[PDB]
Symmetry: D2
């Protein structure tokens, strides 16, 4: 069907893309980057994340594939030398689809803006100290003082979440995980410290205490938000779909990326 291919833009990826386009020319495949049904990403995880956000308005109509021209990536988990066998099976179709949960972030002002995350959404201060009240399903849980907070998808747990001490969870779990960045804990200031894993339909709301300017990042994209009244986190109703052509279990991908490959 309709398909498009993004490239990291180096010599290796551009050339692989042109060779795959030539392979797709031999089948009933039409190149369309407006309404594709298959999005292939050649590069790294950033390149894949860029591709997801390019088509986040059509997630239910697209199956993603990532090719890693550098090291093994978590989302780009197929090798460049296997690009031909990829072109073949993708042209025949009859593949299976694999869905991962996504994360919704809502920012209210004094207006509303929402964002979809594949890895995580983080919050930091514009420059001053970062103080925010953390409210869970309208229950005030803590007042966080520190550098910032990170709300991660399941597949994102191996990313920024991992460096902050968070747990790695399997993407079949529809959940989201909040981790701390350098919280200050003493006699007066008290946070939980432990990461928190929230189920679907739970709402985690951050509410300012003094300064209302916050550096909010969604994957690679970071934006300064002024006069913030509330940041809301919840597991999205939408999901990203992966075209799978063979078994590459999550824990196997985790073993190869962190233990030994």
């Amino acid at each position: 069907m309709k398909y498009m291919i993004t490239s990291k833009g180096d010599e290796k990826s551009d050339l692989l893309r042109l060779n795959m386009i030539a392979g797709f020319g031999e089948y009933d495949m039409e190149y369309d980057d407006v309404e594709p049904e298959i999005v292939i990403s050649i590069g790294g995880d950033g390149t894949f994340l860029s591709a997801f956000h390019q088509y986040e308005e059509r997630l239910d109509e697209i199956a993603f594939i990532g090719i890693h021209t550098g090291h093994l990536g978590f989302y780009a988990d197929w090798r460049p030398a296997e690009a031909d066998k990829l072109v073949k099976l993708l042209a025949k179709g009859e593949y299976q689809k694999v869905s991962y949960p996504l994360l919704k972030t809502t920012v209210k002002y004094g207006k509303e803006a929402t964002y979809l995350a594949l890895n995580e959404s983080t919050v930091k201060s514009s420059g001053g100290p970062f103080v925010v009240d953390v409210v869970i399903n309208d229950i005030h849980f803590e007042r966080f003082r520190g550098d910032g907070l990170c709300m991660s998808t399941p597949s994102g747990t191996t990313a920024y979440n991992k460096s902050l001490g968070g747990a790695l969870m399997h993407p079949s779990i529809e959940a989201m995980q909040l981790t701390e960045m350098a919280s200050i804990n003493n006699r007066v200031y008290r946070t939980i410290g432990s990461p928190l894993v929230f189920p679907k339909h739970h709402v985690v709301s951050l509410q300012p205490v003094n300064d209302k300017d916050f550096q909010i990042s969604v994957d690679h994209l970071s934006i300064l938000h002024r006069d913030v009244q509330e940041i809301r986190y919840e597991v999205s109703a939408k999901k990203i779909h992966f075209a799978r052509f063979r078994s590459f279990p999550f824990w196997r991908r985790v073993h190869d990326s962190f233990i030994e490959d």
Copy 2:
């Protein structure tokens, strides 16, 4: 219906139990510790854990309640001065039931023994170094060298799991979480370090490397197991049921126990 009450055995709990039995005498309540339908625990979380294991053969036929005569416990989350209003509503019935996932541990020899955990199951060595191969759904993930491992239920994440850096997850998530104890990591020895959260139907299997003697604990109960061939972890098909009479949200219980009450 039929009910029984366990006591920590101090003066405070024994007396509260006798006073509740007297209150139940005023209703159509029969004391039966053989086949109760309501199990009340007066004491601490250990007292509650002891009560769960006393009736783990009838979990589907029992709703548990815990009264804390000392500090607030996670499972014993109702106060002694509220014991009368508890007796009333329990006698009328028409309460709601709240299920938490449990953890199944299977130990094979060279025979098989299984155990149900409400908090966690841990593994340590008999005395020598602790080396074990960690296999996830028949995929070899790592070779753990360290002090031991902890596999925790959701409700157990606030217990031993919390002191080992694990995440706290909400008990509506049917999952289990593995955390490390003092793993040795260098150029030759490599573990993941991060906690791992596993969904239902996933099997985590520990397999010995040299010594086959292991100190295996299930909640408060610890047993030396000799000639161990395999320890298997998976989320149980069985669940513990709590009789709830009002909203005491998990994150509220977490706030009170760790932040401030």
Copy 3:
């Protein structure tokens, strides 16, 4: 002798300062904020840190004292109600002096700028990723990829260093401690993770890999440094001196601030 007093600038501290000045008027004490020999700070640890940097050019000629009008601070460890007994003993003199090690940071360009730290010096990126080579006594130790790094004095170990997992060390140890902020560790990227404690006369040098812009902070003061060629850390030859009038042991101060007071 000559003395001055800084104030946090709220009603409480300003009034305490005016009352202490009146008490000093009754003795052979001359107020001089140009060349004082005693610097008193009324407020918090920030107020004390501001006072240290106001006179970092005369550290060998000044003994510091801090009064905490809010909670107990580590540097401001004397209470407002004890201000009179402080005025008395300070006027008589014959006190003991207590020295804490300081931290020297040197920034080279393509020129040189140096800074003295009482708590810590940190490095972060201007906006892009933070990659820096860490060289210890001209030996290349690692290539750090992460959010940033923190080099802490002994007395600073209870401050930012504490929130980053660093050890708390006693200020009689002439040393400095480096801790990580959210390092990325995988098959390709490898840092030590553990905090590092360096003795006197050791030089730790950070060297850029790509981007040469870095947000460098020294205590409360943060400055964007462009075209950075090198950041050098070493234990200063200079020391801050505290006027002590009674035993307030470091570990006692640590107990009161973090365990219970």
Copy 4:
């Protein structure tokens, strides 16, 4: 002068030892394992630790050397193929000596026993819960509830201390570092969590709360101590001396063992 050589006892180490003895036969070297002046250890760090404890009664009269027949060890940091050049220079003498601080542990009963540690001394309970009061220079600092505690030498910081989150410190620092094992922290139970680094002449004393039986380990050696009244930790007046024949800086050894070699 007088010398002896210990062996791990495998084929590789035994044969290297016999070949070095033959090399020493060609010089004015007499084999004496009663009063040696040079102790060579062929094997791993355990083999080296065993050798240190074999002659802990003559530390001031002995310079140690370790050869690693397996992977690089921290104490055994010279390779088997370099054994000949080692024999030569050792026979000529005129080497430099390098001292590392040691750790003294004193156990009182209701009698006294002391031990010297090269890596660390740890405390765990005999079987029940581990509760101990931690007193620093006669000041009560905390009541530790958890799995156990670890008091480490500087050179030991890369060993068990490293797996418990402790900092790695350079052995020219005469100090000792205490780290926690799975402390329980909640509203009622409070420990510092952070590692603590203590200078020379500081005394850290552990004092029982209920059960007085403790599993105390000093390096590889673990002993059950009954009716314990006090465990005291302080930096030893004694030091281990290493015969050095070239520069192998501590941080270089750390880089090779943990980053890449």
